[PDB]
Write a protein that binds this ligand. Sequence first.
Ligand SMILES: CS(=O)(=O)Nc1cccc(-c2cc(-c3ccccc3)cc(=O)n2O)c1
Ligand SMILES: CS(=O)(=O)Nc1cccc(-c2cc(-c3ccccc3)cc(=O)n2O)c1
Ligand SMILES: [Zn+2]
Ligand SMILES: [Zn+2]
Lengths: 176, 182
Amino acid sequence: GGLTDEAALSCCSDADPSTKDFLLQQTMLRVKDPKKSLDFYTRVLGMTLIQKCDFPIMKFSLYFLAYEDKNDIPKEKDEKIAWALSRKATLELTHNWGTEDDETQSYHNGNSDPRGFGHIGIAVPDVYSACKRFEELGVKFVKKPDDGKMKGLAFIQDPDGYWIEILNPNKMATLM
Amino acid sequence: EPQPPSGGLTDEAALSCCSDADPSTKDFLLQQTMLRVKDPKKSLDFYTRVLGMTLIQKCDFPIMKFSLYFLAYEDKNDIPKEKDEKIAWALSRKATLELTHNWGTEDDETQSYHNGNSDPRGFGHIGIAVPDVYSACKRFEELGVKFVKKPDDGKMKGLAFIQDPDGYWIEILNPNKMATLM
Ligand SMILES: CS(=O)(=O)Nc1cccc(-c2cc(-c3ccccc3)cc(=O)n2O)c1
Ligand SMILES: CS(=O)(=O)Nc1cccc(-c2cc(-c3ccccc3)cc(=O)n2O)c1
Ligand SMILES: [Zn+2]
Ligand SMILES: [Zn+2]
C-alpha cells in the first residue's frame, strides 16, 4: 500500500535557514533538433527563448525557454545570463551537436522501459480550448482531455516525444 | 591561433525558429516536472531536509496503486487545510516537482528507476539556484549527500551536481557567477 498522510509528514523536515532563498530554476531535456524544439516551445506552447549558451569546447548548446515577457530580456550579455538563470520554472533544452544528422539517434522520453522522468506540465485556464488549438496545429496527443478516466486533463508530446501534461488547477480536485 | 569548430545553431538562426507567444497562451505556466521515485520516505526526507522544499500536496490513487507527492519552494503556512482549496492552490504553484510512487517499489531490492544520464538518455536534471554554491555543497557533504560533480571539479567551476535517493541529478548553480564561465 501507500504511505498514510501522517507517515509521509513524519518523513518531512522544516526548511533549514541556509536554504531559504533556493529556487527550482530549471528542468533539462535533451533535444535531437533545436530548430523543431524551438518552434514547438515558442509557437505552439507560448514560451520565450530567454537565453542561448554555446559551448564550442564541449560541442553543445543550451536553450533556456520560459514563460517570460520577451521585453524583460536584458540587452547586455552578462546581465542576460544572470537574469535568465535566476528565473523560476525554466526549461533547459540541451542540443549535443550532430544529433540532428544521425538518422538512427533519438532520445528516450522516460515513459517506457527504462522509466524515470515522466513529463513536464503546463497549467492553463481552459484545457479544452488549449487542446482545440493544439489539434488545429497538428500537435501529437498521448491523451485527449476526455479520453480515459480523468476528464479535462491532457498529455501532448513535443518533437522528441517528451510528454507534456495540460492541466487546469481549478478542475483537478473533482478527479479525487 | 585556429579556433574550435562552430556547430549547432547561430543565435540568429535559433531566433529564426522562434515565434512570438500567441495571446491565447498568456496565462500558461510551467507548473511541474514529474519523476518516479522508488521510496517516497527517502525522497521526502531528501527534498525537505536536504533541499529545503515543502510537501505541498499528497494525492493517493488506490485503484491505480500510486501516490503523488508535490514538492515546492513554498512557505508551509501558505498550504490551505481544506482538500479542494489545497489542490487548486498546489497545482497552480510554478516550479513544482511531482514525485510518483508506484506502490511496492520500495520492497523490491532489484528495482530502480533510470536517471536519463546513461543509455538511453533523455531527461538530464533539475536545477536549483542558490546564493552560494560552495557553502550549500559544504552542507550537502556534512549531510552525506552523493555528488556527481563537486563545484570545483571538472571543466566548469562553481557549478555542482548532486543526486537524490533515486539517482536523479540536481544541478546547484549561482546565477550571479555563471557569466564568467563563458
Ligand atoms: C501513475 S502515472 O505515472 O501514470 N501518472 C499519472 C497518472 C494519472 C494522473 C496523473 C496526474 C494526476 C494529478 C492530479 C489529479 C487530481 C488531483 C490532484 C492531482 C496531477 C498530475 O500532475 N498528474 O500527472 C498522473
Ligand atoms: C551538456 S550536459 O548534458 O553534459 N549538461 C551540462 C553539463 C555541465 C554544465 C551544464 C550547464 C551549464 C550552464 C551554464 C554555464 C555557464 C553559463 C551559462 C549556463 C547552465 C546549466 O543549466 N547547465 O546544466 C550542463
Ligand atoms: Zn542545467
Ligand atoms: Zn503530472
